[PDB]
Amino acid sequence: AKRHRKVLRD
Amino acid sequence: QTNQLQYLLRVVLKTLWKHQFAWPFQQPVDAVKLNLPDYYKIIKTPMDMGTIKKRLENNYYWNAQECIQDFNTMFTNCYIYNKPGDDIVLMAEALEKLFLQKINELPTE
């Protein structure tokens, strides 16, 4: 239910 | 538990706060910004590290247990409201692990 991407990827 | 409350501020909160995953937990969940219409229905006791920091700093707590309770509430809210695998839950889990490590070293008294 708070489904946003947050964690940085390369 | 003033030495333990000092520990919770200066060791426990300090370490988690500086973590790369702290930022979604540093302030109250913004349900408007984040389009979470249900959040403030499903979650009965909102909690965040920003609120906990203010409590530690403003002599809110009567013992370290109440503070540890607040930290647990914050993680629980995350786990009961969010979807397994999602970034927010992976972030809560890494913080909870660091939290639990620091709590297992909690000074006596």
Author numbering:
A (entry chain B): 15 to 24
B (entry chain A): 59 to 167
Paper text:
Despite large sequence variations, all BRD modules share a conserved fold that comprises a left-handed bundle of four α helices (αZ, αA, αB, αC), linked by loop regions of variable length (ZA and BC loops), which line the Kac binding site and determine binding specificity. The four helices form a deep cavity that is extended by the two loop regions (ZA and BC loops), creating a largely hydrophobic Kac binding pocket.
In all cases the two acetylated lysines bound simultaneously and with identical conformations to the BRD4(1) Kac binding site. The N-terminal Kac always formed the anchoring hydrogen bond with the conserved asparagine (N140). These structures explain the similar affinities observed for the various combinations of di- and triacetylated H4 peptides. Binding of di-Kac marks separated by three residue spacers as found in sequences linking the H4 K8/K16 and K16/K20 required a glycine or a hydrophobic residue in the first linker position for optimal binding to the first BET BRDs.
